[PDB]
Design a protein around this nucleic acid. Sequence first.
DNA 1: CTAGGTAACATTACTCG
DNA 2: GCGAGTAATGTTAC
DNA 3: CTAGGTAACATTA
DNA 4: TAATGTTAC
Lengths: 226, 225
Amino acid sequence: RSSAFWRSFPIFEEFDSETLCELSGIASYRKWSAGTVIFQRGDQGDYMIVVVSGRIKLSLFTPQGRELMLRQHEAGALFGEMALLDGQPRSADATAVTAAEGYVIGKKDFLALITQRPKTAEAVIRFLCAQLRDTTDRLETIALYDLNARVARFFLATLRQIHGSEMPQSANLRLTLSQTDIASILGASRPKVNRAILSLEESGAIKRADGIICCNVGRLLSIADP
Amino acid sequence: SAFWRSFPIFEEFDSETLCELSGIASYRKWSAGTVIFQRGDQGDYMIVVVSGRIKLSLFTPQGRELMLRQHEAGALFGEMALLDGQPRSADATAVTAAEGYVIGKKDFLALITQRPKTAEAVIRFLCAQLRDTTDRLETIALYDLNARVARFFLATLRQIHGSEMPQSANLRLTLSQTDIASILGASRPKVNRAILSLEESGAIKRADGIICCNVGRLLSIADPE
DNA sequence: CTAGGTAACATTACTCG
DNA sequence: GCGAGTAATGTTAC
DNA sequence: CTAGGTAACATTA
DNA sequence: TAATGTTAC
Ligand SMILES: Nc1ncnc2c1ncn2[C@@H]1O[C@@H]2COP(=O)(O)O[C@H]2[C@H]1O
Ligand SMILES: Nc1ncnc2c1ncn2[C@@H]1O[C@@H]2COP(=O)(O)O[C@H]2[C@H]1O
Ligand SMILES: [Mg+2]
Ligand SMILES: [Mg+2]
């Protein structure tokens, strides 16, 4: 696995072909059984992971016991890069939820590659900006809106993780997350997330067949609003 | 021109690009109570604050406000829509009479791509922000209001100190409780009774303008047991 | 069942010709 | 040395 | 005053 | 067995 295969992942897309193909120069394989830790939020991160198979959850856990699911990453995802670029410890907790395999990249190699072909820095920056926006809109979502709108804005944001650049009218969606996973992302409780999803359905915002939600984008945008 | 080292991002530069090539600020000022730019807007310019207080905030159609930051001297804002083609991501309001220096998109970026280990600086900044913002998000999501206030005081104290943390540290906070309610995504009266709560529980004491925080009582109000 | 939001009212505190 | 314009703080009843 | 949390219980593939 | 739905408070 080293073609134009490295263009599938965020950040690494957007590279010149030289650094790219030559870039499976510095991956090692690894794998993690279903239900195990890759690393913890305390930890030292001198390696960045790139996901080939499986589902890995990035989440914040609090001493009280509470969880904020930051992301569920599957094939084509990139995580663990902040503590690479920035001297700081890991900023979240990475758990394999199902049997997963990826490729790891070292700190010294990566960074040398950045500083060697420096318009790749540019790529990485456009990524961190992207994240910062994503995260601030999450924060606004959780702060200024109620739970129905929170769920609505979650569906519209993922229906931009799929379309984006703009948006039909009725779009089916394979969501792959349980409602416990949605409760964890939205910083709410399972039963109330459930009643909210059902609410969106009974109000004509969505309908749910098994694995598939046909969302009504717009019909969903004013539930997301007033 | 070691004056350009006072601001985030620009600190951390080689002296060549720093004293020079910055070369590329215009003066500008904004009266107390006015808009610099709006969240819709096109941002091809980045601001660097010399005097005054400017609030960066998100406003919703419903009318609600999330204060993202109150920046004063030594602050840098408006850089995301520079680096990234996208519109402005928040709303910048001068709360008091403010003055700054503006830097254009084309100049800035040319400077990045000309001395490329400055990119490195900028990245360490965006990482910093991303962490800051995710810890905010965790704060607002997994904790109650007393802990939210507590974690706000510790974050502003780890910004003044950081890398050390004493035991009792006084703090000049400069924000009203309405400003704290707006940052924490809560309501003024409940923020007030929370602050008072921290005081009556021995976490802080408030003299006029100054809060002597007790870092550690304050850390387990920020937590459980 | 509970931590908060909202409207409304009273004081203190800045502050500016 | 104000008196008139604002805020900022604290509390209470929904 | 009331969204939204919590503990528990039922229906479902 | 896990995923979804509901209820009382
Ligand atoms: N807000 C966020 N959005 C998406 N991914 C994040 C966020 N915060 C942290 N991460 C990822 O989680 C990783 C945890 O370890 P690092 O902090 O080394 O690198 C981090 C990022 O790759
Ligand atoms: N999470 C955040 N934390 C601090 N400042 C932010 C955040 N999001 C946006 N900003 C600032 O607000 C500015 C709004 O316009 P820009 O998006 O051009 O640049 C932005 C940043 O300077
Ligand atoms: Mg969102
Ligand atoms: Mg905080």
